[PDB]
Amino acid sequence: QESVKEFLAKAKEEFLKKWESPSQNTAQLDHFDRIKTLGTGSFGRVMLVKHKETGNHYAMKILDKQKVVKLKQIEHTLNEKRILQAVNFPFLVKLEFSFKDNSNLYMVMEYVPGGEMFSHLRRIGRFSEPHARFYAAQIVLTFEYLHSLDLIYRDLKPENLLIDQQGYIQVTDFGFAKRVKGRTWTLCGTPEYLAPEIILSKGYNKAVDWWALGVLIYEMAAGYPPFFADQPIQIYEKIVSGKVRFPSHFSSDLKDLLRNLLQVDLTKRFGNLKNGVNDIKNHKWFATTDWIAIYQRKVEAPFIPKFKGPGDTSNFDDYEEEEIRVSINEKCGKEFTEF
């Protein structure tokens, strides 16, 4: 379809202009008030903040440089910020500012008060197929965009999909995203969502994203992931076995799509064939989907999150509120010169 081809051609031109000349140092810490911790990790946290002069709310991701080094995440964190400042798509959380100081790296992103899809899925149990399909279509379009820029996302899971005020998806966390024209080799991702070729330490490509879409659709529609087990070693054994059990309430169209996304042979997997993403968009399971209407956000969402305003944190959970310090001396300056 020429209009989609010309859209993606323009999208790539605009990405490459920002990719080759990244923005840096577009804000500073004392322009923001700290409100609440929204999430915590091994080397970073995400905070709700308020801009002092405008009053706007943002989500500020803060990474400790010394911990990033020790956890061997230097290239990944440079990847995350260079990609985020260059992309632009309706279902990607927008990066608004970035900066660094003696101790930390900061990415100030749009705040999505509806919270994670994971919380809503776990509250309700499972999504109906139309509800799962509405979200799945947004991920298909987002991966079509990212893959046309030669980007692999590599972190699809329900926790990284936030629900906005219109009930649409906003994808967050580009920590494992990478520009890859051929193969790449890093072991990363959450265990339930890893493709077999990652587990087997092969050189892999963008088809691992389409495998992960299969896992996400299964989990949305069933309430649990297809290769679930108590320990990661058992999860990995199931992933590479080539078998998967479908609930009887799954439609025949859903089972057929999932068999082709959860295809252990990457050269036979939907999204990685000669027709590319069109094998997915043309599948019978998506016959009711108006792809342009999804992109333009003209479809009524199945669910509108409940929240009181742009500063409401009730859809996120509670964490110990810990100090964020900035050392008198510069740490790891050379490693993060380009940030």
Swiss-Prot record:
The keyword Nucleus applies. The lineage of its organism: Eukaryota, Metazoa, Chordata, Craniata, Vertebrata. The modification Phosphothreonine is found at T37, T184, T186. Phosphorylates a large number of substrates in the cytoplasm and the nucleus. Phosphorylates CDC25B, ABL1, NFKB1, CLDN3, PSMC5/RPT6, PJA2, RYR2, RORA, SOX9 and VASP. Regulates the abundance of compartmentalized pools of its regulatory subunits through phosphorylation of PJA2 which binds and ubiquitinates these subunits, leading to their subsequent proteolysis. RORA is activated by phosphorylation. Required for glucose-mediated adipogenic differentiation increase and osteogenic differentiation inhibition from osteoblasts. Involved in chondrogenesis by mediating phosphorylation of SOX9. Residues 287-339 form the AGC-kinase C-terminal domain. It is found in: Cytoplasm; Cell membrane; Membrane; Nucleus. GO terms for molecular function: ATP binding; cAMP-dependent protein kinase activity; magnesium ion binding; manganese ion binding; protein domain specific binding; protein kinase A regulatory subunit binding; protein kinase binding; protein serine kinase activity. This is cAMP-dependent protein kinase catalytic subunit alpha. Its EC number is 2.7.11.11. It catalyses: L-seryl-[protein] + ATP = O-phospho-L-seryl-[protein] + ADP + H(+); L-threonyl-[protein] + ATP = O-phospho-L-threonyl-[protein] + ADP + H(+). Residues 32-286 form the Protein kinase domain. It is a lipid-anchor. One of its GO terms (cellular component) is glutamatergic synapse. Belongs to the protein kinase superfamily. AGC Ser/Thr protein kinase family. cAMP subfamily. Allosterically activated by various compounds, including ATP. Activated by cAMP; the nucleotide acts as a dynamic and allosteric activator by coupling the two lobes of apo PKA, enhancing the enzyme dynamics synchronously and priming it for catalysis. Autophosphorylated. Phosphorylation is enhanced by vitamin K(2). Phosphorylated on threonine and serine residues. Phosphorylation on Thr-186 is required for full activity. Phosphorylated at Tyr-319 by activated receptor tyrosine kinases EGFR and PDGFR; this increases catalytic efficiency. The gene is PRKACA. One of its GO terms (biological process) is regulation of proteasomal protein catabolic process. The modification Phosphotyrosine is found at Y319. Ubiquitously expressed in mammalian tissues. It comes from the Eukaryota. ATP binds at residues 38-46, 61, 110-116, 157-160.
